[PDB]
Symmetry: D3
Subunit: 152 residues, 6 copies
């Protein structure tokens, strides 16, 4: 939806425990994206198994699901032009060893299993993840007065 | 409840619009308090009238309610020793003119009607506000690994 | 003039040399004040003797004038409600030893003669200083889209 | 010129409105470059048409000129070794979508038309732009005590 | 000794564990004080009992000694005008509940037993503590190029 | 040694003089590495000639040795997975002109001779440099409570 494109991000348990929620949110805010949903939740294994359905055959799947269910996550939806692709760039490579300094994982993480945050990998993935984690009435439309200074 | 004391905070519409959500959360995180609930909501006038019931006879009540209903707020609950009183200190005086530099309002605001954030003014106020804004199942218990370094 | 009140600030040579110009500007920006004039200048002794006319009988006058003429300063005008008094609070006490942490001098300076910045001490002082340092056509009126979130 | 190389930078209207002037200045300061001119101006369309003469055949030229004339810009000259090329690197690609995190545009912008800042693209361009925007007597020589720690 | 006054600071185990060493050092650096000694050590109970000799009859003494011996501390000596008194101001009140925002303890701590840092409380205390924790040959004299911009 | 890998880092004299010690330490802290040794020292030419033995035939060797002996350095050892390689990435290319923004040299330096920091270039180099700069009893083992959130 051009500037109405949306992505799903989640601060993983390690991000909450290391007190980096503010830091992470601040990076998306300063970039210009619009926060349209946010909540702290404890996700069920049932929800996480669907979230990570595509990874079901992978050897880390079981531990990934257990870990993501082990503590609070901060679920979020962000809106803006190219937000899915750009979010992934801000976050950095899956494996923090390949994420350059300046990215979230490049600055804050070491190991792939403790890489702070999840972000949708495509517009289609984001659509699915947003619907899985949030009801329609948790996604807010608000008139963004900053928008005039971010978009032509 | 000692170290289990809780307070309710809300980033007002001006805080969201000015992109200070991360900045505000980061201040409470770095202080050591535990985030136990968080959501972006559009509060109803009905909720706000009860939230501000003690101010009903004051002439700014109506415009305060309308303003707080005018756009998204970020509702939060924070836990720790003396969190209500300490939160109020971090926020600063109601009127930003009286809030010293180092406080949120001292650093970021000018006028009383645009003062970025609400915080409970007492343990009793927090009890009521927490119940009004959040269900029990939105308040998360998590084992805080930082706690050993914040509390004796 | 209410929200149209203006003050004159100058980053002294120590602030330029220590690379704190950005830092200082950012504190006024984040507070919500409107930047209406800015320039890097080398002030003449003639200008400075009049700028500090009220200090002419004081023993530090001569050295203060010579110092402020010794290198570039960053001259500025900021606009907003109570900007003169609030600016002075953000800056902190004249003698940095009495300036609490959170203030510019509290955070960044040690000695009274190297205290980073000048700010007008009154609306009348600001009127004079603005006229003395800037032409009317250097003071810019611009429509401040942040103003809606700083003022009722 | 070596370490005396100079570039012209301007914070565009979006940078002023979003309160990123100090943030931008601070990045050049912390890098070690020397600020040799600075002013807040409202540029005429006449000046801007000459500034962007090489872009006259491009479809965005008209809107670019109108936009840059629409509000204050912060004009600047910075001095140091390789300052033109290095400035461009710190700013990031023209299109923020191609600018990595860590760059100004990578961190703060989304769209090409709202990309915060202009920087000269060559030593020759900088010479022209500096002369177009500043008089000789606005470019200051000062003894930079940090220079001993930036240059061998 | 005027500008040659020195104080002893130590980042307590909680400060190391919470990753606030750099943050703390940066505050003294940005203030203008001169770092003249620094090391990561594990203090013995024997050293700490003498360090806190004046507190020997107090009920928290035993736990304070055990805690400070429980993990690494970062020992430091800082030099500058009024450094003992000013350090204490930057650190904030012993009990973080009384330490305003802007101070280290005001911003980063909650409880008196986990208050991040020790600073000498007097010139006499600093003399003793410096001698107890560091040899003369660990205290470095260096020519401080920033000094001209901090001191008249 | 996996997560027990260690590297040697030193803040060069320019890093101390420009007050970037805290800033540099903070970057390694926030990345998740464990600080296992730290001291401010004045290195002898004899030690530095061995430190840089591999560069003995290079034309900058003499000046490099003299410079590194000219003022205090902050010697450090950091521990964690892939710490040698990752440290080098965080620091950035030898020549700051090739170091992107987000890296220490990319953000803070201009010239190769004033590039703020040394980091070992291999596990073998780190082992040698650690032995050359530190005694065994200066390298501290401590139980890292953050480790659970950085490593699986
Ligand atoms: O060897 C691996 C690869 C991936 N993951 C985790 O699986 C998550 C989702 O995997 P995916 O390949 O989808 O990466 P993403 O798209 O989240 O970067 C990652 O973010 C990692 O935390 C893991 O634990 N081990
Ligand atoms: O004259 C006033 C007093 C208060 N308020 C607003 O009303 C809120 C609640 O007022 P209260 O007296 O409860 O102060 P608080 O508890 O928020 O410090 C404040 O935070 C202000 O935004 C206002 O607009 N005008
Ligand atoms: O004993 C003194 C008092 C003042 N000043 C300097 O002179 C400036 C102007 O003095 P004034 O009394 O106007 O203080 P201000 O209004 O700047 O706080 C101060 O900012 C200091 O930099 C000084 O060097 N010594
Ligand atoms: O397709 C385009 C290309 C450029 N620009 C704007 O035009 C400015 C100047 O264009 P130029 O190609 O000179 O880029 P720059 O030198 O600023 O990177 C850019 O910075 C953009 O703001 C635009 O709006 N659309
Ligand atoms: O009731 C108390 C008082 C003090 N302390 C600890 O003991 C240290 C030293 O106490 P002192 O009175 O010397 O305070 P300081 O000089 O550190 O402010 C403090 O910093 C606290 O960490 C404590 O645990 N409980
Ligand atoms: O042409 C050169 C190359 C290197 N160096 C300095 O010598 C140090 C060691 O050089 P080396 O190639 O070992 O680089 P490093 O491993 O430190 O990146 C560098 O960090 C520079 O400070 C220099 O002055 N000139
Ligand atoms: Mg994935
Ligand atoms: Mg209230
Ligand atoms: Mg005055
Ligand atoms: Mg161009
Ligand atoms: Mg004491
Ligand atoms: Mg090398």
């Amino acid at each position: 939806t051009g500037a109405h494109e949306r992505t799903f991000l989640a601060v993983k348990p390690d991000g909450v425990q290391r007190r980096l929620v503010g830091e992470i949110v601040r990076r998306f805010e300063r970039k210009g994206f619009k926060l349209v949903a946010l909540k702290l939740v404890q996700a069920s294994e049932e929800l996480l198994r669907e979230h990570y359905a595509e990874l079901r055959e992978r050897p880390f799947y079981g531990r990934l699901v257990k870990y993501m269910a082990s503590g609070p996550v901060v679920a979020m939806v962000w809106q803006g032009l190219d937000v899915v692709r750009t979010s992934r760039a801000l976050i950095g490579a899956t494996n923090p060893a390949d994420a350059p300094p300046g990215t979230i994982r490049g600055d804050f993480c070491i190991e792939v299993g403790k890489n702070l945050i999840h972000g949708s990998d495509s517009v289609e993935s984001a659509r699915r993840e947003i619907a899985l984690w949030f009801r329609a009435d948790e996604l807010l439309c608000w008139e963004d007065s900053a928008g005039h200074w971010l978009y032509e």
